[PDB]
Structures are given as C-alpha cells and as structure tokens.
C-alpha cells in the first residue's frame, strides 16, 4: 500500500523474493524482518543496535527461523502486524508508515 | 586380488527420497552416506542399477 | 620473460559450493570472488578447469 515509506515497500518486495527463493507459501513477518535487517541504509539494524540488541545475531536467528518454514502472498500474520504498524503510525502522527515501527 | 574385503552397497532410489522433506535434507542423507563411504577407507563397491536415474 | 613474475590464482567452483545452505549463497561467494578479483586488478591470470562450465 501507498501508506508505507518507499524503503518499507522496498523491503516488502525483497521479503517476497526471500519467500519465493525459499519456496515458502506465504510472506511471513520473518521474511520482512530479514529484508529490513538486510537493507543498506535501513533504520532497523541501527535502531536495534541503539537499544543494545545484537543485530547480526538477530539476522542469523531470523534466517534460521526462515529456514524452518515449510517449503512447497502475505500471510494473515503479516497483514495483522502491518495493521498495527498503521495504528502506531497514526498515534504518532506519522505521514507514512516507516520501517522502524515494524519492530515495535 | 584387490577386491578382497569389500562390500556392495546398492545406491538405492526410493529410500534416499524418504522422510527428508526440504532441500538439503536429501543432501544430508546423501552427504551422510557419502562421507560414510569416504571414511570406510576402501570397503564398498558403490552400485548404480539403472544408471540414467540418479 | 612475458609470463614470469605473474601470480596466477585458479578459481575452484568445487570450493565455491562450500558454505551454501539457504537458497543463494553460492553466488554470494561467487560475487565475493568478483569482489577480491575485482580489487586484485590484473595480478591474477585465471584458469577455468572445464571452461564450458562458465
């Protein structure tokens, strides 16, 4: 949706490619987190680092979780999480929905 | 002489395609049996019936 | 005298398959080979054992 920032949309497109590349049936929040942590210039890794969270170890654990997904297109889980991003953006008065909100 | 002491383990299709679902799990069972033949140190004639299948 | 002093490094695709589990890490390590043979800038003559792989 046009509600997302360009960077967020770009990660979502990447999330779809990750899902496809893994032969997964749906795009899960895991695919999107992986894409966001893998985006150069993205705010998610630094956000996490600023809070003391090891972004690199997180990337590894997310990829491991992705590797566990069944192999055989947003899942409802993802729709649900994105809906929350929308509400968090509204509360904050953000013009568009940014990547950082997905973490929360 | 030269062939004494050796086994013949048939490389068998159907049992290698067993309960190893995703990608790499097939490579896990085949990598396990081929590292096993790599560490038997000269004990198995590998056998490929219907050579065009594998 | 033309081909002396040259430090000739050979690619091993059979080594390049190592360390690829999730779908897309062989070409990770292959374009990393494009990274370091990109910075090497002429020092390395390549030999491709079985050119028609490339």
- For A78, residues 6+ apart whose C-beta sits below 8 A from its C-beta are A26, A27, A28, A29, A32
In C, minimum Cα distance to A63 occurs at C22
Burial of C43 (0-12, 13-18, 19+ CB in 10 A): exposed
Of A21, A23, A67, the CB nearest to C24: A21
Helices assigned H by DSSP within A27-75: 29-37, 44-50, 55-68
- The SS3 of residue A31 is helix
Dist CA B20 CA B43 (whole Å) = 26
CA gap A104, A88 in Å, rounded? 9
Q: Which of A52, A32, A30 is nearest to A42 (CA)?
A: A32
HSE-CB at B54 with a 13 A cutoff on CA atoms is 14
Query: Nearest CA to A46 among A55, A35, A59, A36?
Result: A55
Residues of A in Cβ contact (< 8 Å) with C19? none
CB-based burial label for C34 (10 Å; 0-12, 13-18, 19+): exposed
Chain C environment of A22 (Cβ under 8 Å): 22-23
Angle (CA) A90-A93-A96 rounded to 5° is 75
Could you tell me the two tokens for B34?
């081929």
Instruction: Provide the token pair at A71.
Output: 């192999």
Method: cryo-EM
């Amino acid at each position: 949706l046009d509600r997302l920032t360009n960077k967020f949309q770009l990660a979502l497109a990447d999330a779809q490619s990750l899902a496809l590349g893994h032969d997964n049936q749906f795009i899960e929040p895991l695919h999107l987190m992986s894409a966001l942590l893998n985006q150069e210039g993205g705010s998610v890794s630094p956000l996490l680092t600023s809070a003391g969270i090891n972004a690199g170890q997180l990337r590894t654990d997310i990829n491991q979780a992705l590797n566990r997904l069944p192999q055989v297109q947003p899942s409802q889980d993802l729709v649900r999480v994105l809906n929350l991003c929308d509400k968090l953006a509204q509360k904050r008065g953000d013009n568009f929905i940014s990547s950082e909100l997905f973490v929360l | 002489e030269g062939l004494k002491g050796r086994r013949v383990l048939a490389l068998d299709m159907g049992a290698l395609v067993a309960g190893a679902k995703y990608r790499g799990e097939f490579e896990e069972r085949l990598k396990g049996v081929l590292n096993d033949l790599a560490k038997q140190e000269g004990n198995v004639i590998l056998f490929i019936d219907a050579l065009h299948t594998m």
